[PDB]
Design a protein around this ligand. Structure first.
Ligand SMILES: CC(C)(C)c1cccc(-c2cc(-c3ccc(C(=O)O)cc3)nn2-c2ccc(S(C)(=O)=O)cc2)c1
Length: 235
């Protein structure tokens, strides 16, 4: 379909322009607590929170390129971004997972193993985030699919305090339709692929809810090392 093809192309381009892929980056490592579990490696947390600020900027750039996002009220654009920020950041870091080395790669090439991701701040959430990354791999998702899943996660009408939830639901409707027809065309062998992918958003919300609780825990324990929160940055 030309209207569907055009929508897929726009979302694939919005994602590619705001997300450097694992293959494109020059991986580098750090010796910082690489083989020792610690409650919090402040040097790892410092690098990690600086990378997060840059990634939140890219997410906002991605959101603004989604057809119709900027037509929503400013209050609703802020509400959607605050609610999906952790979900999108989780999806982005899990997209750069290397299973044999059990590492994830940041947008500047920084490559941390499971112990280091735990020490950088993930703590009790590490195994859940790494399990999600492991579940993504067999889906063999391309840029169009990752972009569309990110857009579906963002443009969600069930978020608390939305001024126009039906409008947001209507904006989400062509994205779901595009992903359905796209996965059908590209993978006709597996017709269960589309609901398997939407199930990942359900998994993402659960992990994101736990993540928000960890943000609060970290704000309590290390307030002086906390960068401005997601809510603070987007406002
Ligand atoms: C457990 C917990 C640690 C809370 C957590 C939970 C879920 C997601 C994150 C998270 C992922 C990224 C990220 C950074 C860079 C890239 C890139 O380079 O591709 C990709 C992703 N950042 N990030 C994050 C969020 C808030 C904050 S905070 C408290 O607001 O300081 C700091 C960091 C973190």
């Amino acid at each position: 379909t030309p209207e569907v093809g055009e929508l897929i192309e726009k979302v694939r381009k919005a994602h590619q322009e705001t997300f450097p892929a694992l293959c494109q980056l020059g991986k580098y490592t750090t010796n910082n607590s690489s083989e020792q579990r610690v409650s919090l490696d402040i040097d790892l947390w410092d690098k990690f929170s600086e990378l997060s600020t840059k990634c939140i900027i890219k997410t906002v750039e991605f959101a603004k390129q989604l057809p119709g996002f900027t037509t929503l009220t400013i209050a609703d654009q802020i509400t959607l971004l605050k609610a999906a920020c952790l979900d999108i950041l989780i999806l982005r870091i899990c997209t750069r997972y290397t299973p044999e080395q059990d590492t994830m790669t940041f947008s500047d090439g920084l490559t941390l193993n499971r112990t280091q991701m735990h020490n950088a701040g993930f703590g009790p959430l590490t195994d859940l985030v790494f399990a999600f990354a492991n579940q993504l791999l067999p889906l063999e998702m391309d840029d169009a699919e990752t972009g569309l899943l990110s857009a579906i996660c963002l443009i969600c009408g069930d978020r608390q305090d939305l001024e126009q939830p039906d409008r947001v639901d209507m904006l989400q409707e062509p994205l779901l339709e595009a992903l359905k027809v796209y996965v059908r065309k590209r993978r006709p062998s597996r017709p269960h692929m589309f609901p398997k992918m939407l199930m990942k958003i359900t998994d993402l919300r659960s992990i994101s809810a736990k993540g928000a609780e960890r943000v609060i825990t970290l704000k309590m324990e290390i307030p002086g090392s906390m960068p401005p929160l997601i809510q603070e940055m987007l406002e």
